Design a protein around this ligand. Sequence first.
Ligand code: HEM
Ligand SMILES: *[C@@H]1O[C@H](CO)[C@@H](O[C@@H]2O[C@H](CO)[C@@H](O[C@H]3O[C@H](CO)[C@@H](O)[C@H](O)[C@@H]3O)[C@H](O)[C@H]2NC(C)=O)[C@H](O)[C@H]1NC(C)=O
Ligand SMILES: *[C@H]1O[C@H](CO)[C@@H](O[C@@H]2O[C@H](CO)[C@@H](O[C@H]3O[C@H](CO)[C@@H](O)[C@H](O)[C@@H]3O)[C@H](O)[C@H]2NC(C)=O)[C@H](O)[C@H]1NC(C)=O
Ligand SMILES: *[C@@H]1O[C@H](CO)[C@@H](O[C@@H]2O[C@H](CO)[C@@H](O)[C@H](O)[C@H]2NC(C)=O)[C@H](O)[C@H]1NC(C)=O
Ligand SMILES: *[C@@H]1O[C@H](CO)[C@@H](O[C@@H]2O[C@H](CO)[C@@H](O)[C@H](O)[C@H]2NC(C)=O)[C@H](O)[C@H]1NC(C)=O
Ligand SMILES: [Ca+2]
Length: 595
Amino acid sequence: SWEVGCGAPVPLVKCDENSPYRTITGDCNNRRSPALGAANRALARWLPAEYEDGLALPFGWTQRKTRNGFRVPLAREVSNKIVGYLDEEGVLDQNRSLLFMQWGQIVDHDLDFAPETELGSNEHSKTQCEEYCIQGDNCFPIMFPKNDPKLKTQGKCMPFFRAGFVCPTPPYQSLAREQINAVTSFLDASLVYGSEPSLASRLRNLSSPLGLMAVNQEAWDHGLAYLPFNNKKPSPCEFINTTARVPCFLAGDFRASEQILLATAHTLLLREHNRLARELKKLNPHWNGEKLYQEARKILGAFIQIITFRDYLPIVLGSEMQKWIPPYQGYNNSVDPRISNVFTFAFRFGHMEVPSTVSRLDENYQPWGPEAELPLHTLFFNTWRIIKDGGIDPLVRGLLAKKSKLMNQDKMVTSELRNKLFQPTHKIHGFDLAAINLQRCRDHGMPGYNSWRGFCGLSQPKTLKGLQTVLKNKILAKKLMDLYKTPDNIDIWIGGNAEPMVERGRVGPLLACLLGRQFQQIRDGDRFWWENPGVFTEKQRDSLQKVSFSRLICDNTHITKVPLHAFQANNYPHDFVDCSTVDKLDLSPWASREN
Ligand code: HEM
Ligand SMILES: *[C@@H]1O[C@H](CO)[C@@H](O[C@@H]2O[C@H](CO)[C@@H](O[C@H]3O[C@H](CO)[C@@H](O)[C@H](O)[C@@H]3O)[C@H](O)[C@H]2NC(C)=O)[C@H](O)[C@H]1NC(C)=O
Ligand SMILES: *[C@H]1O[C@H](CO)[C@@H](O[C@@H]2O[C@H](CO)[C@@H](O[C@H]3O[C@H](CO)[C@@H](O)[C@H](O)[C@@H]3O)[C@H](O)[C@H]2NC(C)=O)[C@H](O)[C@H]1NC(C)=O
Ligand SMILES: *[C@@H]1O[C@H](CO)[C@@H](O[C@@H]2O[C@H](CO)[C@@H](O)[C@H](O)[C@H]2NC(C)=O)[C@H](O)[C@H]1NC(C)=O
Ligand SMILES: *[C@@H]1O[C@H](CO)[C@@H](O[C@@H]2O[C@H](CO)[C@@H](O)[C@H](O)[C@H]2NC(C)=O)[C@H](O)[C@H]1NC(C)=O
Ligand SMILES: [Ca+2]
């Protein structure tokens, strides 16, 4: 399309023509186009954006303006009528550990983040959006439908603020509006080390030459590290309990403390980095801080890619895995490794996988304490239940032994997220993640469900009956049709999650295609991929092929009984074996042998 590169905000950096290691910003990965897959640049467009005004106004912005002849429904109205459900019985995934949902949030956070525009921290329009519900520039409030119980209780709307865009923060208008991805498009552990120089540094231990990551010296997990606290007012985690006053954590990714299993998850990764750094020092006492950092970073990064691609994607993609992620044929520099704007909605399938409760389990994998089980909604931004209630160990067993939620067409998203989500600075366990995913689609000019059906070489239902056949569900298809008035108009997040799941997968056909390409691209387009010939040695690669998320766990907690296959539904003590029976990451090949 006639124009060739805008994107003022991001300084260049004369590349690491040098570096044996990725950069923090992801720059210089690709040699001919060094900004490709760099953080802080526009999300990629697989298809052209679709805005009401053709440029930036989201569909649903002007009441009088229709999409394909019809008003689009209110996001919260789609949510109540289709996404919500009462009965949590019969909802669990007989074949998926809770670590399965947790891994996905983590991989997601390594890959993408479209922050809301910061355009007002000394502005009452920062609170004006919430207090008065006035659609209002970067303010695009989710209005409640007439028969919504939150009307009687919370007001007229749920605040919501349009996502930040490249080039102008403010007004400009000639080409379509493009949202930003602020993390690196590479599975590079950016969630552990950060995607800005700025935050990479603050995360590091530069007080010692061991190449360690900063740890919290304010509190400890039985001799085991905790992420450092965050720096900073005003704070989600102190607020949800002003008595414990326990801050949100600090990691390479800002949503680290969104919920306690992710912080947990973040906590396992930090430990692996330091435990990688102390041990590489052992073998190589001659290496300096930096060499220790990057080399650990580097090993940590391969780790994320193997567990994701060998253990995780096949149970997401199932029968479509081969069809989109053929086995690896090496680095291809012609591939675009940028996260697409539709992937950040596609990967939101994880939302139907989150169950309503989280448990903590003691060494016999039995309820740890009197209130061992807790509703997810009280764990939003809850750092205290970790520092002051058991360390991460009990929660990691909850991750091995409990189950994820199963997508279900009549039970899409649990009220804990749909009704009780806490949004920082909106003080009420009372928002709607479904509604918000739906408003966000529109915010990002997402093409509709069929556009994506066509794009994936699948059919495009047009009638009620047509949709019934595709969803294989009459009722969901009526609801759907009475809301949107056509297949054409259905928001992608929800039409994509509404189709039944492929043989041995957890997403339907459309999603396996959307997700499938993207992952193909981030692996094929990565100059530092783990199996890219020449990144790791012969030895190292044979040594890397054995990592397991049951290893991380043993090497980094005081858990001694674990799964062999952590993503599947695992019951103790039957499916739990001793830590000693599991292949280690042998670092012998990392000996910087002679001088
Ligand atoms: C609370 C939240 C979760 C768990 C209890 C949770 C979980 C996941 C899973 C398991 C994901 C994939 C496997 C996943 C993907 C993405 N999410 Fe979600 N998520 C919780 C809460 C949120 C909130 C809040 C948002 C922001 C919504 C907005 O649009 O304002 C959110 C988003 C996303 C997202 C887009 C990330 C981006 O690129 O900006 C995923 C890819 N999630 N989550
Ligand atoms: C905010 O976090 C507080 C902890 O930092 C938490 O208080 C703690 O929880 C209960 C009291 O409500 C107590 O835990 C157990 O132990 C005490 C003594 O050992 C027993 O007498 C109790 O029966 C209980 O089983 C802790 O004593 C208590 N700690 C403190 C400092 O009060 C609050 O509940 C949290 N509040 C919210 C709303 O999250
Ligand atoms: C549900 O959970 C499991 C997914 O984590 C699934 O495990 C794997 O299922 C597939 C398809 O049946 C098989 O895949 C494997 O088959 C060969 C056997 O020669 C393996 O060597 C390969 O690694 C390959 O991926 C496996 O049979 C199976 N896993 C293992 C370890 O072999 C379960 O079968 C599912 N169970 C139920 C009851 O739904
Ligand atoms: C940076 O590195 C050093 C090495 O770990 C840390 O200093 C140690 O701190 C722990 C706990 O206080 C103890 O083992 C000793 O007090 C110190 N020992 C040594 C050998 O230095 C320091 O805490 C680290 N700093 C941060 C912020 O992570
Ligand atoms: C690297 O990727 C590019 C595109 O992603 C591949 O170039 C393809 O070449 C075929 C010729 O048979 C052309 O039809 C297309 O221009 C390209 N195909 C696609 C899907 O874009 C190139 O082959 C890739 N290299 C390797 C080794 O896989
Ligand atoms: Ca990344």
